[PDB]
Amino acid sequence: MASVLEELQKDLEEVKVLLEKSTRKRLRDTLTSEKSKIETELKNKMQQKSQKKPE
């Protein structure tokens, strides 16, 4: 869990760095794309077990 949090935080930090450096509008693209991935991975990792039916 701390693992997952750390990885998400690290990716988010890389995002912040990219946003800051790529202040030339790129921020928008970066944020939109990568935030989706961050959220997706968070949701994946949380739900992953959750007594989920083997669909």
Side-chain angles (χ1 to χ4, degrees):
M1 293 185 64
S3 41
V4 180
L5 296 176
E6 183 178 68
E7 294 296 284
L8 295 167
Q9 177 61 97
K10 181 269 190 177
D11 189 276
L12 192 146
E13 190 176 76
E14 293 182 301
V15 162
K16 290 191 298 185
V17 172
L18 281 195
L19 301 201
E20 291 172 79
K21 292 175 60 55
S22 323
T23 9
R24 288 65 49 71
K25 67 167 180 180
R26 247 287 314 308
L27 327 81
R28 298 177 182 181
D29 305 76
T30 310
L31 185 157
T32 308
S33 57
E34 196 59 48
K35 184 180 295 302
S36 306
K37 313 304 175 289
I38 293 173
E39 290 176 358
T40 298
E41 278 289 277
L42 174 61
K43 261 63 200 298
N44 168 16
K45 271 55 182 289
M46 291 191 309
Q47 295 168 118
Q48 218 171 84
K49 186 172 68 175
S50 192
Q51 302 180 242
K52 178 65 195 300
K53 295 173 64 174
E55 296 181 317

